[PDB]
Symmetry: D3
């Protein structure tokens, strides 16, 4: 099934929203298949934000996330990428609707607690950069009968 | 007052969302007047889709429902039908907004945990087929003073 | 498996604790098999509190629970009677520990929101008086694998 | 920083939504700087509701809020006025989105639990009438580092 | 009715536990009658902690709380003092039971987020020092019918 | 600081309690420094329950564990080992107090969702076997000021 990369940014971990964010994804009926905590290299981040290497404020971004703690995740399930983005909200937490992670907990775009994959093509690249194949664990979700067809 | 028929489908009870769903409805200021758990008779469940039978997936539903457990409910209150549908969300939980039951908990249209009446006319018919008159309990809501006129 | 009778008293319904209470039982890994809302006849209650006819304030108690709404339930699972009593707390919500329903939500013994069966013998009697056998619904709990054995 | 006046109306306090409301504002990353409980005097309420003097039922509006309890607050933070409005929802809780206070808890515009300032200019006026400058407490929010720039 | 003085200490406000704490007290069926945010002046703090004068570290005590923000409260209800203490927990959050504020949120006796009055006599003293009589608001709790006799 | 090894067992992941468990630990003021999801090897698993060889149920737990997914964790903080145990509850979820993970979610000792280290000595051994040194992430907890000295 469709996989997406969801990463709790440093400010997410600092504010103690790790549990809350996971709970939100679990309750949706989604499948956690990989999770790790790491202080990301400025070189792992260089490749994750290759798409956004084309942004004016970049020299501030990479050093930032590299410092603070990060909880990297992969979640699996039908229309994973879009629904994760839906659960997260818009980029700007001010224009982001209530009910979303960013719309319930964030104020500024520089500190939006979470990253979600923008497209399925973006997701598959992001997963490979952040995780080893061995890391992605295969398990049968007992509940999938009552979430899916 | 306006009454609507809300029914937690099998997948709802299996995932343990009975309490959460009810709490959502209670906190909105609505009045629970009837609740029951039953395995719906294929026969008596047949009339629930009597209006929509002209659909490709009809035989599969009257199977996954009748076998699994169901919590049938009637809730009362101002604009009950529309608000119930609001609380539930769209048919497809992908297009359904966050904050709603289906937008918080569901992924696939085949397993969207809950039913809500689509109109007042549809509600009155659905109440009649699922519940006996004696079943609908009459009680004075003490809090209605502070929710209504 | 072991069954117990749990009944949300009228003050429970009035305060909108129906959802919350159920949620607590659901999260424990317990199995809801019967649920009904009714205004209990003074005769149904006359027998439910027959063992408790050994109390000074009895003529005032049956009239009370008779008036307001009541949500009657049966829950199934290993050590259901004891654990339900555990989840509920002591009779007196003042001496009842925090974490319990009565210790989180109640102040007075006259208004303690919920009833739980005191013993397995008392439970089987209580279930028979409040429910018909047809009411008790048989369903396979998918998650039982990961709660039991 | 931008300040807004948020006031839980009497029906909010009645329904025990004070904690819940505050939690919602806390979790958004906002800064409570003043809070007080009062039974608002005609004097304050006439100035607070000066714009609504051109309405048939005004003598009773300044008399309802004058009766019940009210929790007056000031919250501080980036885009405070608009975000507060967003967290609260539309005036009519029927058209207000789910996820909001009014869309989660309210049914009628007469009883919508909370007030939020409509503009920055409205806010500064509202704060001055409800609170004394001494009441606005200055404190360093430790977490503002991780919510703001 | 019985009144107690409950004060969220600065670390409670810092960690965004104001709403959470209030909700806990609301849900218990208790009556908030006064609330105020202040940076406690040396005068108040010397009188609140008058019994801790014969202790080595007293000047740093009154200077910690005189720094950070504090939410002062009065709550009313049957056995208010004891149950407040019960909801709060033991002084040391390590020996305090789970379910309590201190046992759910705290680790160190120096930072245990909340104060609760230890006796009725202590409470009436504490209320007088922190609040003016005008500040204690009188209101009829609609729900007290269903919490009390 | 004191470190402990906390592991959500298969049944925990299946029932979707990962988020909730984590939140419980975060809200206590504890610091997550390592997290990973894996299907545990026989070789890795056997040394974990090495001391529990002289026990009747030794082979069968390795069956229902290795197959299922597990979320291994390391948490750091004052009195981490005992508090983790406190947060978890007793071995048997029948005798385990309400408020605890096992007392809120579990029924049988075979499926009690989580493991916690029994002593500091047992913790440091468990961390070593489950995680590499590189895996334990070093980060400054901004909120530690307000939870500790």
């Amino acid at each position: 099934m469709e996989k997406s990369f969801i990463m709790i940014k440093p400010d997410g971990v600092q504010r103690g929203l790790v549990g809350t964010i996971i709970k939100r994804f679990e309750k949706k009926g989604y499948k956690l298949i990989a999770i790790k905590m790491l202080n990301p290299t400025e070189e792992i981040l260089k490749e994750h934000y290759k798409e956004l290497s084309d942004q004016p404020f970049f020299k501030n971004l990479v050093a930032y996330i590299s410092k603070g703690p990060v909880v990297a995740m992969v979640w699996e399930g039908v229309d994973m990428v879009k629904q994760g983005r839906k659960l997260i909200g818009e980029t700007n937490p001010l224009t982001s609707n209530t009910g979303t992670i960013r719309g319930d907990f964030c104020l500024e775009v520089s500190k939006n607690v979470i990253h979600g994959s923008d497209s399925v093509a973006s997701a598959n690249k992001e997963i490979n950069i952040w995780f080893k194949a061995e890391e992605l664990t295969q398990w049968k979700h007992h509940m999938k009968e009552w979430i899916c067809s």
